[PDB]
Amino acid sequence: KRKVVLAEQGSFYIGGRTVTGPGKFDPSKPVIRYSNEGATFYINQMYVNFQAPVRPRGLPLVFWHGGGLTGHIWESTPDGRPGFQTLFVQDRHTVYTIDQPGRGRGNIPTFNGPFGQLEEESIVNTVTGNSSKEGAWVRDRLGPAPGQFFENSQFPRGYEDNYFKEMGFSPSISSDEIVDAVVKLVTHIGPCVLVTHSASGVLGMRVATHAKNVRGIVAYEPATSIFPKGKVPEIPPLADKKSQIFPPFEIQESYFKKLAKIPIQFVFGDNIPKNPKSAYWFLDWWRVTRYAHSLSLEAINKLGGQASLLDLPTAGLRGNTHFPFTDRNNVQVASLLSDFLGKHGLDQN
Amino acid sequence: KRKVVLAEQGSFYIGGRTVTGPGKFDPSKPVIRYSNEGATFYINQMYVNFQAPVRPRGLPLVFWHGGGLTGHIWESTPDGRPGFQTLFVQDRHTVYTIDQPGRGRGNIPTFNGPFGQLEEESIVNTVTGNSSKEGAWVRDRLGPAPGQFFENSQFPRGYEDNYFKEMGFSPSISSDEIVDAVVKLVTHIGPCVLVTHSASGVLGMRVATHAKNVRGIVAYEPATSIFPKGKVPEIPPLADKKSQIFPPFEIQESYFKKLAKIPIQFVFGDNIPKNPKSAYWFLDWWRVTRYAHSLSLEAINKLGGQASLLDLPTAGLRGNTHFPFTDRNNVQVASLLSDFLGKHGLDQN
Ligand SMILES: COc1cc(OC)nc(NC(=O)NS(=O)(=O)c2c(C(=O)O)cnn2C)n1
């Protein structure tokens, strides 16, 4: 069912700072020539929208897109089925979705001059990076190579154009400033649950160590593992014996211990191999990355935590990609999120 | 006043093309290093969202943000009151809002290399332009100089930071490709009404000349005037006797004539001077720009059209800025839009 009843909805900007050009602004002089002269720029702010059901129950959910994405991935699937935003408003949660700084409706810090440069200061790099359709295909485990699908895939096949159109570049904004914006959002809304994805997995972990209002984390296929400083376990290279996964993020142990105080669940889809796969770099990357996360959750649990790893195939769901929340079975994926929230009372007032 | 009941909601991507890097993609090689080799890139696609009421009436509305903006400006005001999206779903219209190519969730075409460059080809310029807080303050007629308000202003004071944070740069995407994406949307949705703003004013006029499904246009303070080719009337410079307004866009008369076949209203706010104001460049710019538009509407009416200029002060609304649909009296502004829709039969099935 697609019907949704909202007590209220809206959007707002939060976070960011200002930077300034030289000189003074003269309102009698041509303004459209557009210079940095006397200019104030708001940079690195974050876009937030919310939908609140009638009679909400439990804590609000904050959905945080993965790398190169926007809040669109929580609104609808590529083939136009309801996303988690609709599903969880229907589940009587207030739902926030964000476009983080540097992505979508979040700020891209650029000015009058080469991209990212304000006179002689480099706010973000002029040289960009961006994934390709082919890179994203294998990153997301649609299949082992572009154009190919794993058997019993849950990808909405035929909607590849819609799917890859949602992805884009990110400028070199400091991860510190992205975490800061979401910490400010968590302060603004009160106790809440973070639901993260891929690149925003490690960032949401960082937010929780700065914000007691984060009462729970569910992370869909986080990309970067996190460990106490100096206590990164041995992690093997990839099957090509030269490549490695993302360098794990290290935080002071006093902050790492805060992750032991809240329920945390990492969710993984299908077709992550058990054994080395030299022929398919990103399948092997996911094998080792998932292994690193299992060690990260173990370290949290050794400090008193409540951290768990959910492989969707163990729960009877086969064929999920790196985006289980937009796959064809995303209602069943949502049902498992509801189960986690209910188990820990995060769906009660 | 905030409750909304939706039969369905969602978002999707539409329009755009692809460009390709050199070489071929090999899934056995490191994918994350990140390069253009073997790369297909989707570029210039547009983001679209929709909210459909239960029991819709009349034609769907397409809200099209002004320059440097996004669909946020139709969602909420900077002080958090409902935007036109909520107001017109409550008025039982299906409401589409877009982030055009190059803005917000629309695509920004950049790759692996200097911003906008795909190997040797410049897709968009590496040098950007962007307005400042100061330039936007006087552009939007909050007051005559940055930090100063007109006594009558309808701006939601105290929420300046929120307001200016919604603005950003646009890469040098061809206007043809922006018009193309919206023509494809209008083809997809069927008969509809365009509601435009500032920079999207001239673009919406162009869409209507390509798309018979556009059945009406309301433009809030369009920034660029439009005339039949070779029939641009005499337009004076600004009071400084050096500056000019935006060069009017010229189209073939066979296309311009299609503007005479639908109702068209341009809406202007307050504090546009009647006499030359050499001390306040953007106040004077709005005086001459509004004059040019009056001549543009006259040309449409001389081709049998029904094109009107609504000055909000003549309807009893004083103090409106360049964003009347987010001002403190935006409910009264919406009432005037509903009047236009009802008079022209655009709110009946
Ligand atoms: C349109 O709907 C909402 C919802 C919401 O919360 C669920 N907050 C706003 N705005 C809002 O709070 N602005 S604000 O006041 O300027 C502000 C502060 C502050 O000063 O207390 C801190 N952050 N910010 C953004 N709009």
Short mmCIF file of all heavy atoms in Angstrom, two decimals, chain A residues 16-17 43-45 64 100-102 107 109 122-125 170-182 203 206 249:
data_model
loop_
_atom_site.label_atom_id
_atom_site.label_comp_id
_atom_site.label_asym_id
_atom_site.label_seq_id
_atom_site.Cartn_x
_atom_site.Cartn_y
_atom_site.Cartn_z
N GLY A 16 27.05 23.64 9.20
CA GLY A 16 27.83 24.47 8.30
C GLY A 16 28.52 25.62 9.03
O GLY A 16 28.34 25.84 10.23
N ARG A 17 29.34 26.34 8.27
CA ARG A 17 30.05 27.53 8.76
C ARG A 17 30.02 28.58 7.66
O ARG A 17 29.41 28.39 6.61
CB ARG A 17 31.49 27.17 9.19
CG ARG A 17 32.29 26.45 8.10
CD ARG A 17 33.60 25.89 8.66
NE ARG A 17 34.34 25.09 7.68
CZ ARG A 17 35.36 25.53 6.95
NH1 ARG A 17 35.77 26.79 7.07
NH2 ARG A 17 35.98 24.72 6.10
N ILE A 43 28.88 27.55 3.90
CA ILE A 43 29.41 26.31 3.34
C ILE A 43 29.20 25.14 4.30
O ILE A 43 29.09 25.31 5.52
CB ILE A 43 30.91 26.43 2.98
CG1 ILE A 43 31.76 26.73 4.22
CG2 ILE A 43 31.12 27.46 1.89
CD1 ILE A 43 33.24 26.45 4.02
N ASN A 44 29.12 23.94 3.72
CA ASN A 44 29.09 22.65 4.41
C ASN A 44 27.85 22.45 5.27
O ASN A 44 27.83 21.55 6.13
CB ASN A 44 30.38 22.43 5.22
CG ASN A 44 31.59 22.31 4.31
OD1 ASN A 44 31.43 22.15 3.10
ND2 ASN A 44 32.78 22.41 4.88
N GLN A 45 26.78 23.20 5.02
CA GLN A 45 25.50 22.94 5.66
C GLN A 45 24.85 21.68 5.09
O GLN A 45 25.15 21.23 3.98
CB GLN A 45 24.56 24.14 5.50
CG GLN A 45 24.25 24.52 4.03
CD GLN A 45 25.24 25.55 3.47
OE1 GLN A 45 26.37 25.69 3.96
NE2 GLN A 45 24.81 26.25 2.43
N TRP A 64 20.41 7.78 6.64
CA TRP A 64 21.64 8.44 6.19
C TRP A 64 22.21 7.67 5.01
O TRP A 64 22.75 6.56 5.16
CB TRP A 64 22.63 8.51 7.36
CG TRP A 64 23.84 9.35 7.14
CD1 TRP A 64 24.30 9.86 5.96
CD2 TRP A 64 24.77 9.74 8.15
NE1 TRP A 64 25.46 10.58 6.18
CE2 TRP A 64 25.77 10.51 7.52
CE3 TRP A 64 24.85 9.53 9.53
CZ2 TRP A 64 26.83 11.08 8.23
CZ3 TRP A 64 25.90 10.09 10.24
CH2 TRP A 64 26.88 10.86 9.59
N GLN A 100 23.68 14.80 3.11
CA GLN A 100 24.82 15.25 3.90
C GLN A 100 25.57 16.36 3.16
O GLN A 100 25.41 16.53 1.95
CB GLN A 100 25.75 14.07 4.20
CG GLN A 100 26.75 13.78 3.09
CD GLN A 100 27.57 12.53 3.32
OE1 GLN A 100 27.20 11.66 4.10
NE2 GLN A 100 28.70 12.45 2.64
N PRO A 101 26.38 17.15 3.87
CA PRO A 101 27.18 18.18 3.19
C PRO A 101 27.96 17.57 2.04
O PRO A 101 28.54 16.49 2.16
CB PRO A 101 28.10 18.72 4.30
CG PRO A 101 27.35 18.45 5.56
CD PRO A 101 26.63 17.14 5.33
N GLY A 102 27.92 18.25 0.89
CA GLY A 102 28.60 17.78 -0.30
C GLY A 102 27.78 16.91 -1.22
O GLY A 102 28.26 16.57 -2.31
N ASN A 107 25.25 21.40 0.93
CA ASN A 107 26.07 22.40 0.25
C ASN A 107 27.28 21.77 -0.45
O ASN A 107 27.95 20.89 0.09
CB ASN A 107 26.58 23.44 1.24
CG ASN A 107 27.64 24.35 0.62
OD1 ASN A 107 28.83 24.21 0.91
ND2 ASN A 107 27.21 25.25 -0.27
N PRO A 109 30.76 23.35 -1.51
CA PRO A 109 31.44 24.63 -1.27
C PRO A 109 32.28 25.08 -2.45
O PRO A 109 33.44 24.70 -2.58
CB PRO A 109 32.32 24.35 -0.04
CG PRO A 109 32.49 22.84 -0.03
CD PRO A 109 31.23 22.28 -0.61
N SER A 122 42.06 26.78 -0.65
CA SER A 122 41.39 25.60 -1.20
C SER A 122 40.45 25.05 -0.14
O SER A 122 40.89 24.43 0.83
CB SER A 122 42.43 24.57 -1.62
OG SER A 122 41.81 23.40 -2.10
N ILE A 123 39.15 25.30 -0.31
CA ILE A 123 38.17 24.72 0.60
C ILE A 123 37.96 23.24 0.30
O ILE A 123 37.98 22.40 1.21
CB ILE A 123 36.83 25.49 0.54
CG1 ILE A 123 37.07 27.00 0.74
CG2 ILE A 123 35.84 24.92 1.57
CD1 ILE A 123 37.73 27.38 2.06
N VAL A 124 37.73 22.89 -0.96
CA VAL A 124 37.73 21.52 -1.44
C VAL A 124 38.56 21.46 -2.72
O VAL A 124 38.82 22.47 -3.36
CB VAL A 124 36.31 20.96 -1.69
CG1 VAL A 124 35.53 20.87 -0.38
CG2 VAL A 124 35.58 21.78 -2.72
N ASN A 125 39.00 20.25 -3.07
CA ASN A 125 39.89 20.07 -4.20
C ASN A 125 39.20 20.39 -5.52
O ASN A 125 38.02 20.07 -5.71
CB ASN A 125 40.42 18.64 -4.25
CG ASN A 125 41.36 18.34 -3.11
OD1 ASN A 125 41.94 19.25 -2.51
ND2 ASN A 125 41.52 17.06 -2.79
N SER A 170 31.30 13.36 -4.75
CA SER A 170 31.34 14.14 -3.52
C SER A 170 32.63 14.95 -3.50
O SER A 170 33.71 14.39 -3.76
CB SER A 170 31.24 13.27 -2.25
OG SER A 170 30.30 12.22 -2.37
N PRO A 171 32.57 16.24 -3.19
CA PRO A 171 33.79 17.04 -3.02
C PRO A 171 34.50 16.64 -1.72
O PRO A 171 33.95 15.95 -0.87
CB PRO A 171 33.26 18.47 -2.94
CG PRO A 171 31.93 18.30 -2.25
CD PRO A 171 31.36 17.01 -2.85
N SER A 172 35.74 17.14 -1.56
CA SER A 172 36.62 16.66 -0.51
C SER A 172 36.33 17.34 0.82
O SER A 172 37.25 17.80 1.49
CB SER A 172 38.10 16.90 -0.92
OG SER A 172 38.37 18.27 -1.12
N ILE A 173 35.06 17.39 1.22
CA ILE A 173 34.72 17.96 2.53
C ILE A 173 35.30 17.08 3.62
O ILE A 173 35.28 15.84 3.53
CB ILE A 173 33.19 18.11 2.67
CG1 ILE A 173 32.68 19.10 1.62
CG2 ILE A 173 32.81 18.53 4.08
CD1 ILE A 173 31.18 19.16 1.55
N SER A 174 35.82 17.71 4.67
CA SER A 174 36.35 16.96 5.81
C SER A 174 35.26 16.09 6.45
O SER A 174 34.15 16.56 6.72
CB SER A 174 36.91 17.91 6.86
OG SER A 174 37.26 17.21 8.04
N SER A 175 35.58 14.82 6.71
CA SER A 175 34.62 13.96 7.40
C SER A 175 34.25 14.54 8.77
O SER A 175 33.15 14.30 9.26
CB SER A 175 35.17 12.54 7.53
OG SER A 175 36.26 12.48 8.43
N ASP A 176 35.17 15.30 9.38
CA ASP A 176 34.86 15.95 10.66
C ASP A 176 33.66 16.88 10.53
O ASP A 176 32.82 16.96 11.44
CB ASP A 176 36.07 16.75 11.16
CG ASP A 176 37.26 15.87 11.54
OD1 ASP A 176 37.14 14.62 11.55
OD2 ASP A 176 38.34 16.45 11.83
N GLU A 177 33.58 17.61 9.42
CA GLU A 177 32.48 18.56 9.26
C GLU A 177 31.18 17.84 8.95
O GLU A 177 30.11 18.35 9.28
CB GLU A 177 32.83 19.59 8.19
CG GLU A 177 34.02 20.47 8.58
CD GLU A 177 34.21 21.67 7.67
OE1 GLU A 177 33.27 22.49 7.55
OE2 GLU A 177 35.30 21.78 7.06
N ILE A 178 31.24 16.67 8.31
CA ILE A 178 30.02 15.91 8.06
C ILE A 178 29.47 15.35 9.37
O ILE A 178 28.27 15.45 9.65
CB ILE A 178 30.27 14.79 7.03
CG1 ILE A 178 30.63 15.40 5.67
CG2 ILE A 178 29.04 13.89 6.89
CD1 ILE A 178 31.22 14.39 4.68
N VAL A 179 30.35 14.77 10.19
CA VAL A 179 29.95 14.28 11.51
C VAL A 179 29.37 15.42 12.34
O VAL A 179 28.35 15.25 13.02
CB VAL A 179 31.15 13.61 12.20
CG1 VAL A 179 30.85 13.34 13.67
CG2 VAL A 179 31.54 12.29 11.49
N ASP A 180 29.99 16.60 12.28
CA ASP A 180 29.52 17.75 13.06
C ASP A 180 28.08 18.12 12.71
O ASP A 180 27.27 18.38 13.60
CB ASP A 180 30.43 18.96 12.83
CG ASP A 180 30.08 20.12 13.75
OD1 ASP A 180 30.16 19.92 14.98
OD2 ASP A 180 29.70 21.21 13.26
N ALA A 181 27.75 18.16 11.42
CA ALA A 181 26.39 18.50 11.03
C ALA A 181 25.38 17.51 11.59
O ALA A 181 24.33 17.90 12.10
CB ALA A 181 26.28 18.58 9.51
N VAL A 182 25.70 16.21 11.52
CA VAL A 182 24.74 15.22 12.02
C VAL A 182 24.69 15.23 13.55
O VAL A 182 23.63 15.00 14.14
CB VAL A 182 25.08 13.83 11.45
CG1 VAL A 182 24.21 12.76 12.09
CG2 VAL A 182 24.89 13.82 9.93
N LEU A 203 30.68 6.94 9.71
CA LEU A 203 30.36 8.30 10.16
C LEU A 203 29.29 8.27 11.25
O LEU A 203 29.36 9.05 12.22
CB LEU A 203 29.90 9.15 8.97
CG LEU A 203 30.89 9.32 7.80
CD1 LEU A 203 30.32 10.22 6.69
CD2 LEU A 203 32.23 9.87 8.29
N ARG A 206 30.85 7.35 14.48
CA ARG A 206 31.50 8.52 15.07
C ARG A 206 30.49 9.45 15.72
O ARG A 206 30.72 9.96 16.82
CB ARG A 206 32.30 9.24 13.99
CG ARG A 206 33.52 8.44 13.53
CD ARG A 206 34.24 9.12 12.38
NE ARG A 206 34.72 10.45 12.71
CZ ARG A 206 35.27 11.28 11.83
NH1 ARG A 206 35.42 10.89 10.57
NH2 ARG A 206 35.69 12.48 12.20
N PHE A 249 39.18 3.04 10.64
CA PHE A 249 39.21 4.29 11.39
C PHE A 249 39.50 3.99 12.85
O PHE A 249 38.89 3.09 13.44
CB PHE A 249 37.88 5.02 11.26
CG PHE A 249 37.92 6.43 11.74
CD1 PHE A 249 38.48 7.42 10.95
CD2 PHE A 249 37.38 6.78 12.96
CE1 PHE A 249 38.51 8.74 11.38
CE2 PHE A 249 37.41 8.09 13.39
CZ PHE A 249 37.98 9.06 12.60
#
